[PDB]
Structures are given as C-alpha cells and as structure tokens.
Amino acid sequence: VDPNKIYTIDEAAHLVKELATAKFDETVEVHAKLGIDPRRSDQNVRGTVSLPHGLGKQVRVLAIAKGEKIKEAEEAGADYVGGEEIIQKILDGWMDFDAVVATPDVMGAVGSKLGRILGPRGLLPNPKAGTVGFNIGEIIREIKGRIEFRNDKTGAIHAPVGKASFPPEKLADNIRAFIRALEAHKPEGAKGTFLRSVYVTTTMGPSVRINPHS
Ligand SMILES: [Cl-]
C-alpha cells in the first residue's frame, strides 16, 4: 500500500485481485498521467485499443443482422440481437448499448433510418470502422475488446482493462496492450517524459503504481 512502491505489471496484476474488496466483481483500470498539454490542439490523445481479452458487459453490443447471421451473433455473445425491426426501438429513444455492429444486408435500412441518430453518436455501423461485415461473430468478439480512451484537460487518461475476477496473466496482457496503445498515440510534438506516472486500480480499491515498461 506504500504510495512510493513501484510494482511491475505482473506484480500489480496479482495484487489488484487482493485489493478488490467490494461486494461485486470490480472493474480493473489503468490510469496514466501523460506528458502533454491538452489545452493545445496539437496535443490531445484520443483513440481505442483492442485488448487481447474482451471485457464482457463493459462493452454492450447490439448486432443487427438477417437469417443465419442472427444465430451467429447470439452465439458470439452479442448482448442484443435483432433484425431491421429493432430500428423503431432506437427511434423511440432506446440507446442502452456501447457499440452497434451489422451485416452488409441490413445497412440499407440502418443507414437511412438511423444515420442521423447513431451517426453523431459514433454508434453507426461503419465498414470503415470494421463494424459492418458478414463475419459478424468475429466482429462481435473484436468489439468486445475495443476500448476507447481520451485524455482529460489535466493530461490524465484511463481505461478499463478487466475485472478483478480475471486471471492475472490476462490482466497483465490487457494492461500492456493499453500502455502500448497510449505510446502509439503520443503527439508528434510533445517533448517531455510521455508516461509520467501510471497506476493500476479497481473501482473501489487502492491504486498500485506500476513501471509501465515491465
Ligand atoms: Cl467478410
């Protein structure tokens, strides 16, 4: 619990499981202080990482599909599965999902009816974003691991990387993948130490400082 102690990623992945004391399976997060000034247009860090191990309910997925592809989406573990008939539910205000994926053959209606609704919300299935294809099961599994990140005005950033229930090797894998993605997103122009400090923590537990290069 010593605030000065820097743990390796492997040590942290084992520790966080012992620091998760809530009456529910807590989310594990990585928090970093970045060496950037987010008040500069040329120094924001925003993007996604695809984690090697998907995050279950952390990313609620609606799949819109037809025929055999519906059963494929269900089997892949999409939280909601429907055909074009789900369009009216969304028109009515239903927005309880974190991502939408679809097969090419429903996009006529999805694009025309839900373009102006899901589009601005960054939730419209998009070939360009890898969220429209006939490989709906693969898309679903990938999207369950696709985590968005965005620095706040202080230059701090964070992301969920698992649950306290995860095996430690899976937490470690996801922790490193997230850090690698931050480094991949360093602004060209930022000059000082990029990863100023990095922590692993749970929703309601202590923070454990880590060496992000371990
Ligand atoms: Cl394909």
Swiss-Prot record:
Q: Does the keyword NAD apply?
A: no
Key words, A-Z:
Repressor, Ribonucleoprotein, Ribosomal protein, RNA-binding, rRNA-binding, Translation regulation, tRNA-binding
Xref: InterPro entries: Ribosom_uL1_bac-type, Ribosomal_uL1, Ribosomal_uL1-like, Ribosomal_uL1/biogenesis, Ribosomal_uL1_3-a/b-sand, Ribosomal_uL1_CS
Any one GO CC term of the record: large ribosomal subunit
Keyword Metal-binding (UniProt): no
**Gene3D superfamilies, sorted:** 3.30.190.20, 3.40.50.790
Name its GO BP terms in alphabetical order: regulation of translation; translation
Taxonomy, superkingdom: Bacteria
A GO molecular function annotation here is: structural constituent of ribosome
**Short name of any one Pfam family annotated for the protein:** Ribosomal_L1
**Subunit record text:** Part of the 50S ribosomal subunit.
Question: What function does the entry list?
Answer: The L1 stalk is quite mobile in the ribosome, and is involved in E site tRNA release. Binds directly to 23S rRNA.
Q: What family is reported?
A: Belongs to the universal ribosomal protein uL1 family.
Q: Which NCBIfam families match?
A: rplA_bact
Q: Report what the protein is called.
A: Large ribosomal subunit protein uL1
